[PDB]
């Protein structure tokens, strides 16, 4: 019921055969028009014996690859298939060479991250010294859906004192207008635009589009 | 331009003030001192003082209104004003979070190529265990061996494999001889060697 | 570590105890019907009778069989022979790697979403350098001396009588952006706002320059 | 970059409306003392408008205005071409290369993960051994053209011949007196199986 310690674990024998020879036709070792030689001396060429030689090529004849009809040799038939009959057996896509482009692709993904990790630590130091070169230009929030004080006049919101950022423009409805003074009320889908430092975003960010 | 960009000194102070108020310096309703005495701890003019002090008056965490100091009112909405004005979403502390994410995930991709090798490495060693233990494959609808019998389709040549059992609509066949035929939606079962699975992959819903 | 030198192989009794169990569900082995005995077991699997004797406790502890006798194992359940077969699989080493390996997958796909989440925020927070040229801001000084000076911005409701938001003040050499209503004016300061064009001049003529 | 700073600066004024089309700005010396730079900085300043085209200084009185579509053109390539608008997209492109990288590792784990063999599961599929202990009839033939499952309904799934275990050993393959064979189907097919080889 188990297997014999003496027998090893092994393939049959035919297929080998058949693959061995069928990659030699797929090189070119064996032209389409010349023939193979006798059943012994391909026999002798893998020093095994001639009746599982002629199995093997049996496989390429079923194949197609070759045909046997002719008492002088092996003839053989088709390279395209041979080339077809060595990329289906040889699948290229067994779980070993899935594991080595697994393994390039993780490798890949932590260069990309090791990239990213530099690109963010420049971004910061760019927007520490855009707030000193352009220290006027304004920022754009969009009032989103999540909301709380929307249709609020500006000076009933004391917005300047949780935000630090003074608002100099809003896009109601389209509508883009400059300094709009305290009476003015926004509603939901706004474009506000602001002024401040480096941080008037995040802080006009939880205040307006946060509950 | 040819000075200093400085924000609003009087912002500074209200956030000191509430700072300590919430950390419990000054606790609820207890009496303040003068605006020109803290202005002096502060370095500060007193009126500029005051008004940073009249930031939080305005916010509604203390009171001013009699003349001897500052009384508290609410600690918990100086902790909401501090929450709120002081870093929470800026772009450093989200550049810390970021390199945290990555970091991790650095990390966990690793144990993802150990995974991978160990899984590679017991595949193949539980192949040589259990030699004649089968596989299963679904045939999808791409393929061009549809309703064609083990016969003809030359399976073992191109596959190296042995098909076992079949499940055809819900009916489980075991050892079904060359006149069975092959549908979309049907299990195959088979043995063979390691590679066998990739094979029949390529063979039947691939190319 | 397994060093290069060496194998795993799953011990001969557990595959015993498979093969038994496999033979049991799938009913070559009825219930009522008596195994052989422990030494001929051994021999038809060519191991040790001690190694056969794990095999059938294996079986015994799941309650498969019973060996109360000498005679041999008496057959116990042929639903429990597949349950143990339904433990063993799940339980074996790619099994759990397999669910590892999935488990992993899973966790760095939401990582990878906290990632394109905190990168939103992070990216939006951005000034705009030139393509806002309506806000670009005027600049007026408190050259010639004026009037409302030591008052802060909120208390004289500038944009009631200039139509302009303030959005710095260069105090003698201090570049304050958005200084708010509690903000002094004083003379020689840089001035900086926001409006239209008949708001620098409305600011000028509030402001008795021109 | 201060003079770049000058060049967005009226450039903006020229977009915003604030020197009308056609209007013409004082000596470059004028504004220059206007600007806390130098005069010989505004020049070059504005010789990058004039460079392209929202200005013409051919004038020695001062600068013509030309164009404010022109203008707006500038404002809008500054923008683009400023370095934190080159690093946000930098890191967009990266944040999806990745997203793309981690979809193709789905999809080749998933198809990793799938070749695995049921050590245990498939009791229906447990083989049997069979033991040619007696030599005679059916021996020295291919299986296939024995007509192995014809008469006997059984798939041979492994030879065990001379010390040599073959799996999956194919239809060429050949029965000898003393091999171990392995097939597979049921109580039945064993019986059948047996009684072909005239074991019993």
Redesign the interface.
Known sequence: ???????????????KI?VAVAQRIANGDYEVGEKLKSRTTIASTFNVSPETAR?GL??LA??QILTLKHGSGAIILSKEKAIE?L???E?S????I??G???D??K???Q??????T??????L??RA???????????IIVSEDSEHLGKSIGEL?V??????????IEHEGK?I?????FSVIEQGDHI?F?????????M???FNLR
Do not use: C
């Open positions: 019921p188990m297997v014999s310690e003496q027998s090893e674990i092994v393939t049959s024998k035919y297929q058949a199995k049996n496989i079923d194949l009959f990329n289906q057996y699948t896509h067994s779980v070993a899935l594991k482009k697994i393994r692709n993780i890949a993904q932590q990309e991250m090791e990239e990213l990790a690109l963010v630590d420049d971004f910061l760019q927007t855009v707030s000193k070169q352009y220290p006027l230009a304004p920022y754009e004391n300047w004192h949780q935000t630090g950022a003074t608002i100099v423009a883009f400059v300094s709009p003074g305290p635009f002024v401040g430092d480096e941080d008037v975003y995040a802080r960010k939880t205040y």
